[PDB]
RNA sequence: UAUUGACGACCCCGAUUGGUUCUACUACAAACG
């Protein structure tokens, strides 16, 4: 885009930026708050990992994505049980909230493996975070074990998954880059 | 029953270990005000 505003690069030099880029950077402040608020152990900023954790020799972007919700929602009329509108809304709504809670709860469990971890996106059935490298396969194993364990026990998912796939759980998968800290 | 009647060199290397252990990329420049 054309330049419209000025902002500061990571070196702190003033640079030309678009109004798109400018409003994104303005909002990163409210984002970093909300992500940290999930758990006090979390680090607010990649800069704050660099402050608090100079020992790090590696870093890992984790990206994790929930599985099957789209096909369930495309078919949810089958799975609500009683074929009535009032039940559809309730089941649809609670299922959607339940997966957000499962992702949050599974995340607050998994971080016990470390806290040198910065969340980037954390909501719905979808997670991505910057971990301490050489703790991310273990954090993601623990997260995916805890995401299943959450969706097993979480009543609002349990019965639907049973009718959808014959087991009372959902699943998620993860990509784990594992990167040296200055790498893009 | 125990006689016949003297010659002649050999060995030339043999057995075994034949790799073992550590370091396997490290900082960077692009990420981050």
Quick gist of this model?
The protein has 184 residues and is an alpha+beta fold. It is 49% helix and 20% strand.
Describe the structure.
This protein has 184 residues and is of the alpha+beta class. The protein has helices at residues 19-36, 46-52, 69-79, 85-110, 136-153, 155-165; strands spanning 5-8, 14-17, 59-67, 117-123, 126-132, 171-176. The strands form two sheets. Strands 4-5-3-6 form a four-stranded antiparallel beta sheet. A two-stranded antiparallel ribbon has the order 1-2. 24% of the residues are buried.
Topology, pairings included?
Layout: E1 5-8, E2 14-17, H1 19-36, H2 46-52, E3 59-67, H3 69-79, H4 85-110, E4 117-123, E5 126-132, H5 136-153, H6 155-165, E6 171-176
This protein binds one RNA strand of 33 nucleotides through residues 7-13, 25, 45-47, 49-50, 57, 59, 179-184.
Q: How can the largest sheet be summarized?
A: 4 strands, antiparallel
- Report the end-to-end length measured between terminal Cα atoms: 22 Å
Number of helices: 6
Label the structural class. alpha+beta
Bin the helical content. Answer: 40-55%
Give the overall form: globular
Question: Tally of extended strands?
Answer: 6
Residue share in β-strands: 15-25%
Succession of helices and strands: EEHHEHHEEHHE
Strand order across the biggest sheet? 4-5-3-6
Give Rg in angstroms: 20 Å
PDB class: rna binding protein/rna
Keywords: CRISPR, CRISPR-Cas, type III, complex, RNA, crRNA, RNA binding protein, RNA BINDING PROTEIN-RNA complex
Entry title: CRISPR-Cas type III-D effector complex bound to a target RNA
Name: Cas10
